[PDB]
Amino acid sequence: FRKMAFPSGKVEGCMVQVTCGTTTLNGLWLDDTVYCPRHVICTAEDMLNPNYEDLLIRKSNHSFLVQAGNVQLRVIGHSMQNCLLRLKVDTSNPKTPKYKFVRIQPGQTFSVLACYNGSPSGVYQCAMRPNHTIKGSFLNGSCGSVGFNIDYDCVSFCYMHHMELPTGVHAGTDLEGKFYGPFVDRQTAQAAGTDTTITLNVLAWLYAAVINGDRWFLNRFTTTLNDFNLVAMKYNYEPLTQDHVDILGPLSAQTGIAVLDMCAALKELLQNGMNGRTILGSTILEDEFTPFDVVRQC
Amino acid sequence: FRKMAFPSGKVEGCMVQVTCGTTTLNGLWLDDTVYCPRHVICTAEDMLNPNYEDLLIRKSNHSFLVQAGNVQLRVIGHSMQNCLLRLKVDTSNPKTPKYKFVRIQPGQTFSVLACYNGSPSGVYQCAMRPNHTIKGSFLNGSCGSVGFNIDYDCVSFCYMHHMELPTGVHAGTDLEGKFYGPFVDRQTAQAAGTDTTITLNVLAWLYAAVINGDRWFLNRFTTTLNDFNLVAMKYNYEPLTQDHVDILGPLSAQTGIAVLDMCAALKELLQNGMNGRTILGSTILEDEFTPFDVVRQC
Numbered sequence: 001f002r003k004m005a006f007p008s009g010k011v012e013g014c015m016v017q018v019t020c021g022t023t024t025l026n027g028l029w030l031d032d033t034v035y036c037p038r039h040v041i042c043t044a045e046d047m048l049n050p051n052y053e054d055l056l057i058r059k060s061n062h063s064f065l066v067q068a069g070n071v072q073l074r075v076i077g078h079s080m081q082n083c084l085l086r087l088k089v090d091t092s093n094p095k096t097p098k099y100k101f102v103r104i105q106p107g108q109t110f111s112v113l114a115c116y117n118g119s120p121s122g123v124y125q126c127a128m129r130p131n132h133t134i135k136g137s138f139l140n141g142s143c144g145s146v147g148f149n150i151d152y153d154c155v156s157f158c159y160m161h162h163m164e165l166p167t168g169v170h171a172g173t174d175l176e177g178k179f180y181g182p183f184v185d186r187q188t189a190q191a192a193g194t195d196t197t198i199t200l201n202v203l204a205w206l207y208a209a210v211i212n213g214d215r216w217f218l219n220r221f222t223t224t225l226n227d228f229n230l231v232a233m234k235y236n237y238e239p240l241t242q243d244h245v246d247i248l249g250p251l252s253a254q255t256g257i258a259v260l261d262m263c264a265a266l267k268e269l270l271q272n273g274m275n276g277r278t279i280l281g282s283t284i285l286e287d288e289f290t291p292f293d294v295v296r297q298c
Numbered sequence: 299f300r301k302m303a304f305p306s307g308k309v310e311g312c313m314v315q316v317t318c319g320t321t322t323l324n325g326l327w328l329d330d331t332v333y334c335p336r337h338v339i340c341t342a343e344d345m346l347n348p349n350y351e352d353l354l355i356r357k358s359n360h361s362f363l364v365q366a367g368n369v370q371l372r373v374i375g376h377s378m379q380n381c382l383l384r385l386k387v388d389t390s391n392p393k394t395p396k397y398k399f400v401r402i403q404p405g406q407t408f409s410v411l412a413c414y415n416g417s418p419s420g421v422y423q424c425a426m427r428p429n430h431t432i433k434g435s436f437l438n439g440s441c442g443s444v445g446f447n448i449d450y451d452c453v454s455f456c457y458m459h460h461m462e463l464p465t466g467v468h469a470g471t472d473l474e475g476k477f478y479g480p481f482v483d484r485q486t487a488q489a490a491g492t493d494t495t496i497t498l499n500v501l502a503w504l505y506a507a508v509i510n511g512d513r514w515f516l517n518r519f520t521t522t523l524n525d526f527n528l529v530a531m532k533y534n535y536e537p538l539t540q541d542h543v544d545i546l547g548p549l550s551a552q553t554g555i556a557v558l559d560m561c562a563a564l565k566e567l568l569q570n571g572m573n574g575r576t577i578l579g580s581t582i583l584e585d586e587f588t589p590f591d592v593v594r595q596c
Contacts, residue, residue: 004420009307122302
């Protein structure tokens with residue numbers, strides 16, 4: 001059972017490089033706008049204490065160098081939106097796909113097109129951690145890279161990379177420039193809080209296992225929701241609300257396994273262990289597939 | 299440390315649907331040729347005992363329906379190459395990228411663009427297992443889907459999916475239509491042999507760990523190659539040749555950790571265990587990153 005990224009073609013045609021002075025990062029070109037992290041305007045000395053609105057009101061249009069492959073795109077306007085610069089260029093991207101901008105919740109998944117200086121290098125699937133960060137060293141030096149989902153023909157942009165935190169996890173914003181989490185776009189003390197396991201996703205992955213033939217771990221005993229949350233919290237799992245439980249409705253319907261019955265199986269799995277046995281050929285519980293991802297891939 | 303797929307844009311523009319009668323699968327459109335598994339010509343009754351050259355000499359050009367999105371592409375020729383049909387169409391793909399065809403070795407990695415009836419649905423990274431199969435239910439119903447690597451601007455096609463084996467792993471061919479492994483393109487008894495862990499890749503992943511700060515597991519004791527292979531084989535690991543050892547040269551150079559020293563660390567890891575500790579935040583040893591993948595992603 002594999003982590004899949006969305007095909008990245010529709011996003012690749014949107015990736016450009018933005019340079020201000022000696023700083024360069026990735027930007028996203030849609031219609032005649034280029035979106036990038038506004039800290040591209042910062043010198044390393046500015047970055048400790050940046051006055052973004054002063055720095056931005058004081059920059060000329062021609063001080064921005066935007067490149068689509070080798071081709072310079074002239075900037076003809078610039079404004080700020082929260083933590084993003086929106087740069088007007090003189091050319092509409094002929095490869096602009098159908099898109100929207102959405103803001104995602106913790107636990108949800110998306111694909112990241114990792115880029116270096118505007119050139120796509122790889123695509124990764126990942127989840128937004130409950131602490132509003134994303135794990136995995138893959139975003140190191142690709143500020144501006146974007147996270148997205150594809151809904152048949154429409155690209156829903158949800159993430160833009162801004163920074164690496166002291167523990168090496170990544171922080172960024174939605175495409176309206178609002179951070180996920182309490183973080184800021186300056187070089188200062190910030191810390192990812194404690195993280196927890198995405199309980200709903202681990203439940204979804206146990207349903208994926210049942211769908212794929214694996215039944216040995218089904219519950220031997222009943223649980224209540226409350227007793228379930230009591231045990232799960234001891235293993236650093238997120239507590240499960242009623243509404244979380246209900247999101248598992250379709251997977252429950254299609255398998256015949258009641259949601260609280262699957263909670264019971266997980267509770268017994270945390271307490272009693274796999275003991276060398278495997279689920280989906282794994283010795284560990286996976287928490288970066290949402291219920292939606294499981295329905296889609298099964 | 300994340301599994302990355304190559305950006306799939308260059309391959310997406312090549313994916314079409316091929317239909318013969320009631321059978322449809324994916325094909326790959328390059329210049330004026332469409333490549334697909336030749337079992338597209340089979341009825342379910344043919345598939346038990348197909349006479350491919352008779353079935354193929356007896357089919358007309360117009361009995362092949364090739365669709366690029368909604369757009370029919372007229373077939374104007376057909377020949378067989380080993381287990382692939384090469385169909386001449388009347389139109390050159392305007393999106394043909396720079397490409398080559400290469401045949402890969404067991405243990406090597408590639409990206410798969412999983413498609414349904416010609417439409418890209420997701421991209422996955424994977425390795426060719428030592429038993430010449432590929433693991434992970436992701437290829438279920440996407441015969442014709444292709445595996446590739448990208449070398450800066452050139453797509454190296456290496457795999458085309460043909461079949462699922464009784465254990466649910468996938469089997470396929472290179473783009474000259476030669477199977478990887480002893481398998482055949484008919485519905486008959488075939489079995490993946492026993493598989494082993496890709497020792498060289500697990501070593502590469504331990505070097506990735508060192509590159510990323512993780513040093514706790516470095517060897518406490520010396521080993522010879524022979525003593526190493528003796529222990530590894532007991533844990534169902536592939537034995538390591540001298541030439542395998544030498545492929546680890548660059549990772550050794552860049553880290554300062556001699557290859558036999560890393561063999562020692564793995565040997566001690568297999569025997570003594572992680573005991574709750576993590577490498578690269580994982581409690582298990584990963585075997586689907588090659589030495590090349592590690593250099594590239596670090």
